[PDB]
Design an enzyme around this catalytic site. Structure first.
Site, PDB file in Angstrom:
ATOM      1  N   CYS A 122      55.129  25.498  35.109  1.00  0.00           N
ATOM      2  CA  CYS A 122      55.767  25.780  36.387  1.00  0.00           C
ATOM      3  C   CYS A 122      54.849  25.632  37.605  1.00  0.00           C
ATOM      4  CB  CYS A 122      56.430  27.176  36.373  1.00  0.00           C
ATOM      5  SG  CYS A 122      55.718  28.414  35.243  1.00  0.00           S
ATOM      6  N   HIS A 263      57.481  31.007  42.475  1.00  0.00           N
ATOM      7  CA  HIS A 263      56.020  31.038  42.475  1.00  0.00           C
ATOM      8  C   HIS A 263      55.582  30.567  43.840  1.00  0.00           C
ATOM      9  CE1 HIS A 263      55.811  31.937  38.369  1.00  0.00           C
ATOM     10  NE2 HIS A 263      55.708  30.724  37.861  1.00  0.00           N
TER      11      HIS A 263
END
EC number: 1.2.1.11
Length: 357
Positions: A122, A263
């Site tokens: 990710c 994130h």
């Protein structure tokens, strides 16, 4: 049409994929076949039913993959394997997808005869969608990273724990917070107390996450002192860029904070040619239709460059761009991306669409 099997399509990542595919009518371009691990619809463990498919798409996880992948390949199966788990990310006969970035690499691999396609990490995937240009023009020399990672990265039970933690923390000073004149120091004394108490749920993180932070993600690698999470930064970034022979240094520290599914990353990028800040921007904004260059202005950064803003969207904003006190060959950047989309499901859904075409 192409016969594609789906495994672990009911898990968190599998669900985001199913929804994205529905939203974009991807099922009208293939023959879907669903499998399950339940004994309560085919069996995800039936090698023969699996051998009949043209493509296998799995969000089940590392174990499944490590148990079924080899078994299938043993039957001479000729099909394609699209996996979101990291189980096969490194293997030489496997490629890490992120087409908006490494299409060219994917194209060549499809010709060389590669049959294994794995989505990337990710954080790395999100970083590449943000400052892809810099890697395009080859202006990057190295990158130091500090991440502000979300709970969804570790899992569903983690997101539920974080929320629970936040709840208990406010509930501990619920009355004092309502009195506009109560002592702030007493209030925090209490919140810190509950945070530190025995009944405070921390089984999933191994420490408090709500109202705090954890500067350690995944396992330790005595080898370089990194955590497996920080390592993927160097490893996977280059394997995605096919520069595993001319390795660009990407490294830093990974930290999880109290955010659900986005994130964020603080970047310190060392360039290779003092270029106008005004130029470095267009180079970033041009690489792909998703990245969004956010002007270094307060009111707009607060409205655009935050998890609250990009959550559940495919937008990848990058901002706070400027040269650093270390010289005009040092760029600073901050970015935010949805961990479940470009950091997981989206890259898989894209290679798949490319395969059934």
């Amino acid at each position: 049409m192409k016969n594609v099997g789906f495994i672990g399509w009911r898990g968190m990542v599998g669900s985001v994929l199913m929804d994205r595919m529905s939203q974009e009518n991807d099922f009208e371009n293939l023959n879907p076949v669903f499998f399950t691990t339940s004994q309560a619809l085919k069996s995800a463990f039936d090698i023969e039913e699996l051998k009949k498919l043209d493509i296998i798409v799995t969000c089940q996880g590392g174990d499944y993959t490590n148990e079924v992948y080899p078994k299938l390949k043993a039957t001479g199966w000729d099909g394609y394997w699209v996996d979101a788990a990291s189980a096969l990310r490194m293997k030489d006969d496997a490629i890490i997808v992120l087409d908006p970035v490494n299409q060219h690499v994917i194209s060549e691999g499809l010709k060389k005869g590669i049959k294994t396609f794995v989505g990337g990490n990710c954080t790395v995937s999100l970083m590449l969608m943000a400052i892809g240009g810099l890697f395009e023009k080859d202006l990057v020399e190295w990158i130091s990273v500090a991440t502000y990672q979300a709970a969804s990265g570790a899992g569903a039970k983690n997101m539920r724990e974080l929320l629970s933690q936040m709840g208990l923390l406010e509930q501990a000073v619920s009355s004092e917070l309502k009195d506009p004149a109560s002592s702030i120091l007493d209030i925090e004394r209490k919140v810190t107390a509950k945070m530190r108490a025995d009944n405070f749920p921390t089984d999933n993180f191994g420490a408090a996450l709500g109202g705090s932070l954890i500067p350690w993600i995944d396992k330790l690698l005595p080898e370089t002192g990194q955590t497996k999470e920080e390592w993927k930064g160097y490893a996977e970034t280059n394997k995605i860029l096919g520069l595993s022979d001319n390795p660009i240094p990407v490294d830093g520290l990974c930290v999880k904070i109290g955010a659900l599914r986005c994130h964020s990353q603080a970047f310190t990028i060392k360039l290779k040619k003092d270029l106008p800040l005004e130029e470095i921007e267009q180079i970033i904004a041009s690489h792909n239709e998703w990245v969004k260059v956010i002007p270094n202005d307060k009111e707009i950064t607060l409205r655009e460059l935050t998890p609250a803003k990009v959550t559940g969207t495919l937008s990848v904003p990058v901002g706070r761009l400027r040269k650093l006190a270390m010289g005009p060959e040092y760029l600073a950047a901050f970015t935010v991306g949805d961990q479940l989309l470009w950091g997981a499901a989206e890259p898989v859904r894209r290679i798949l669409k490319q395969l059934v075409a």
